[PDB]
């Protein structure tokens, strides 16, 4: 993730001094469109884990949490996620795979929700900055929308 941040910093440096509808900005938009699926996958990673942190603190999710220790089984986690109706079946399966459930299939929801927050903050902010910069300097590009 830190390496991704460095690469995005290089891209922003390339954008230094760019004018509206600049050639380098348009080339960068073309590059992102060429990498569409992978850019979508990275954005989905960030969005999924931000939404996970938001959900784990929700009253509805905490209703599915019942164990005294505060651990939720994989099955209760699946039921809770389905109720929130914010993730798809494959997304919930991926979250369960990342949950690091113990030998009894119990997940520590707090640790799971906070694991990727700090590590991904720098690259997340830099991606937001890159998208904002490109959006403001290439206004009428439907591909960036």
């Amino acid at each position: 993730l830190d390496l991704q941040k460095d690469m995005v910093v290089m891209l922003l440096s390339l954008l230094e001094g760019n004018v509206v509808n600049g050639m380098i900005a348009r080339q960068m938009v073309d590059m992102l469109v060429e990498s569409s699926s992978n850019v979508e996958m990275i954005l989905k990673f960030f969005d999924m884990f931000l939404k996970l942190k938001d959900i784990v603190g929700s009253e509805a999710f905490q209703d599915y949490v019942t164990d005294p220790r505060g651990l939720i089984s994989k099955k209760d986690f699946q039921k809770a996620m389905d109720s929130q109706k914010q993730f798809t079946g494959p997304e919930i399966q991926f979250l369960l795979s990342c949950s690091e459930a113990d030998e009894n299939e119990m997940i520590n929801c707090e640790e799971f929700a906070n694991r990727f927050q700090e590590p991904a903050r720098d690259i997340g902010f830099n991606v937001a900055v890159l998208l904002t910069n490109l959006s403001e300097h290439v206004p009428h590009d439907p591909r960036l929308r």
Binding site: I55, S58, E59, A60, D63, S83, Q84, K85, Q86
Partner: protein, 48 residues
């Protein structure tokens, strides 16, 4: 604090035209807050 008294009342929207405020609130609010929790706050009978 006082308006907390009319949320579960059967006639909450008596003068206001929107008679489906409770349905709207439950649909946007309910997945994140809990449909049964919202139904209890707004005095709604989910079964009926």
């Amino acid at each position: 604090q006082w308006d907390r008294l009319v949320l579960n009342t059967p006639s909450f929207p008596s003068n206001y035209w929107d008679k489906f405020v409770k349905r709207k609130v439950l649909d946007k609010h309910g997945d994140i807050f809990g449909r049964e929790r919202i139904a209890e706050l707004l005095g709604m009978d989910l079964a009926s």
